[PDB]
Amino acid sequence: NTLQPGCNQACYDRAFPISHIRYWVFQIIMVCTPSLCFITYSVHQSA
Amino acid sequence: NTLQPGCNQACYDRAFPISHIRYWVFQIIMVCTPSLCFITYSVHQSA
């Protein structure tokens, strides 16, 4: 509720510094990473 | 600086409850009144 240009952008950035979806995507990939490490090590060990 | 309907009216009314011009008009007429009283009394006295 304002007439000031740029207030919307600053206020949204302050309210939601990082969106939930991006945090969750990062978490999912990071949590899957160790399984990838183990699988790649297993592949390397054989041949 | 707002998007709220009616904010302009309320804020103007609070800032300037009575305009200077109307106060000055009232003052001028009121200050002239006693001379009017004296003149009308003088007219009444004669005839």
CA atoms within 13 A on the CB side of B37: 6
Say how many C-beta atoms besides its own lie within 10 A of residue B35's C-beta: 9
Taking an 8 Å cut-off on Cβ atoms, the answer to whether A1 and B1 are in contact is no
Taking an 8 Å cut-off on Cβ atoms, the answer to whether A2 and B2 are in contact is yes
Nearest CA to B32 out of B42, B43, B20, B24 is that of B24
Q: What is the resolution of this structure in A?
A: 2.1
Are B1 and A3 a contacting pair, CB within 8 Å?
yes
Which residue type, as a one-letter code, is found at position A16? F
Chain A neighbors of B2, CB-CB under 8 A: 1-3
Which residues, 6+ apart, have CB-to-CB distance to B4 below 8 Å? Answer: A1
Taking an 8 Å cut-off on Cβ atoms, the answer to whether A1 and B4 are in contact is yes
